[PDB]
Amino acid sequence: EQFKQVFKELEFLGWYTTGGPPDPSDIHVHKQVCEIIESPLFLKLNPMTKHTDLPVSVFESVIDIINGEATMLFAELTYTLATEEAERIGVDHVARMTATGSGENSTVA
Amino acid sequence: FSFKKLLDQCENQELEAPGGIATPPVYGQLLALYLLHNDMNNARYLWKRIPPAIKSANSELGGIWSVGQRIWQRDFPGIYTTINAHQWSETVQPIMEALRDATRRRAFALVSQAYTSIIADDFAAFVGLPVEEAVKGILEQGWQADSTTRMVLPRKPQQLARLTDYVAFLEN
Numbered sequence A: 001e002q003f004k005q006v007f008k009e010l011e012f013l014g015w016y017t018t019g020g021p022p023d024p025s026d027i028h029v030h031k032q033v034c035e036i037i038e039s040p041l042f043l044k045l046n047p048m049t050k051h052t053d054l055p056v057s058v059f060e061s062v063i064d065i066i067n068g069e070a071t072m073l074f075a076e077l078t079y080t081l082a083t084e085e086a087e088r089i090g091v092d093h094v095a096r097m098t099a100t101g102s103g104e105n106s107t108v109a
Numbered sequence B: 001f002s003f004k005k006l007l008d009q010c011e012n013q014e015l016e017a018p019g020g021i022a023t024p025p026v027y028g029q030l031l032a033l034y035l036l037h038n039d040m041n042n043a044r045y046l047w048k049r050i051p052p053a054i055k056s057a058n059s060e061l062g063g064i065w066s067v068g069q070r071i072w073q074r075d076f077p078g079i080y081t082t083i084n085a086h087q088w089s090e091t092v093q094p095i096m097e098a099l100r101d102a103t104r105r106r107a108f109a110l111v112s113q114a115y116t117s118i119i120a121d122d123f124a125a126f127v128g129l130p131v132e133e134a135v136k137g138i139l140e141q142g143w144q145a146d147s148t149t150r151m152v153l154p155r156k157p158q159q160l161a162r163l164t165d166y167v168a169f170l171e172n
Helices: A024-034 A085-096 B002-015 B024-036 B040-049 B052-057 B059-072 B076-085 B093-114 B120-127 B133-139 B159-170
Strands: A014-018 A041-045 A057-063 A072-076
Touching: A014 A024, A024 A041, A024 A072, B002 B024, B024 B040, B024 B052, B024 B059, B024 B093, B040 B059, B052 B059, B059 B076, B076 B093, B076 B120, B093 B120, B120 B133
Parallel strands: A014 A041
Antiparallel strands: A041 A057, A057 A072
């Protein structure tokens, strides 16, 4: 109700988390979110990554017809990086500047 | 490197003396070596340092000073004559053989830099050899020479560590 007053034509899409590969707890939280919206997304950032690809990974729920107990799985997705004019200007300004140091460490560091 | 090892060997021998006076050949070597290094002020003071009694005793010392007087006035055509007026024994002779070459190369550098046109008569007296350079210089070194007027025309032919030292000083 708060954000509906400012962003009028914007709606709930999913949720996000920080961690490594998807965990079972992520599946329970996805089940909980599914009660709010029919088809929720699932973003996942990995601040502890150790490689040169963007840690952000977008998943999507899939319901299986496995015999006996019924389970739900995550299917990966391919995402774009669309930006608007002001967002692009701000991101360029933030990433270009390097005078960010403060504290004990030298500016050389 | 090898030559420098012999230079400092003779330096200290004069300082330690049984009576403040060293052997005559040690005095002569230092005076001749000073000429080779073009250090004229210390060569002049060394001559003033030698006592008059030993100075008159050995005329070999005087022969070094007569040459030194000419090079002190920068008399290039005259030094070549004083270096041959006397005869130096083989013990000091090789040093003179190197001073003559040093003077010869000094004239070559001075002429090529301070002169745009020089008479062949004067240039020969500078370099020291008016014997065979008259014909050899035209075709080998490329200096165009004109006869009759006798004019020679000389022609002209790790950091990152230092920078971070500056910043580490300025910021602290």
